[PDB]
Amino acid sequence: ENIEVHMLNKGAEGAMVFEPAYIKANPGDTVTFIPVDKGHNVESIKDMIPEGAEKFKSKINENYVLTVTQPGAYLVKCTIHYAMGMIALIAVGDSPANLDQIVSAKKPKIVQERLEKVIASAK
Numbered sequence: 190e191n192i193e194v195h196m197l198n199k200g201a202e203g204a205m206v207f208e209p210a211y212i213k214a215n216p217g218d219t220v221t222f223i224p225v226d227k228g229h230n231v232e233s234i235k236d237m238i239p240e241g242a243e244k245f246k247s248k249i250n251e252n253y254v255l256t257v258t259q260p261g262a263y264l265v266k267c268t269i270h271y272a273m274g275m276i277a278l279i280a281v282g283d284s285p286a287n288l289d290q291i292v293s294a295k296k297p298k299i300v301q302e303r304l305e306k307v308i309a310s311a312k
């Protein structure tokens with residue numbers, strides 16, 4: 190299956206967001222990131238992707254189709270607006286083994302609050 194994600198300057202949760210910012214997927218699924226607004230990209234955060242998944246980085250303003258394989262949680266960001274809270278969390282499979290680690294990992298205070306909200310009122 191495919192899951193469409195939009196990158197926007199302004200969304201329900203504020204400025205610089207991924208909608209949806211919580212993505213539940215299965216191995217083999219694809220996630221397509223569409224920058225409806227310009228000046229955005231998608232990139233995996235170091236140490237916040239699973240076991241053997243490979244890191245990735247898209248081009249600014251480009252549509253990017255990610256194929257998810259390894260089960261576990263992935264924290265991704267917009268390289269350009271990471272500091273302002275632009276993140277999305279992808280959960281591949283049930284009970285992702287690295288979720289608690291990611292939630293504890295060090296990262297900007299604004300992304301943390303955003304991350305807390307996506308796991309809470311959502312899932």
Ligand SMILES: [Cu+2]
Nearest residue numbers: 229267269270
């Ligand atoms: Cu951005």
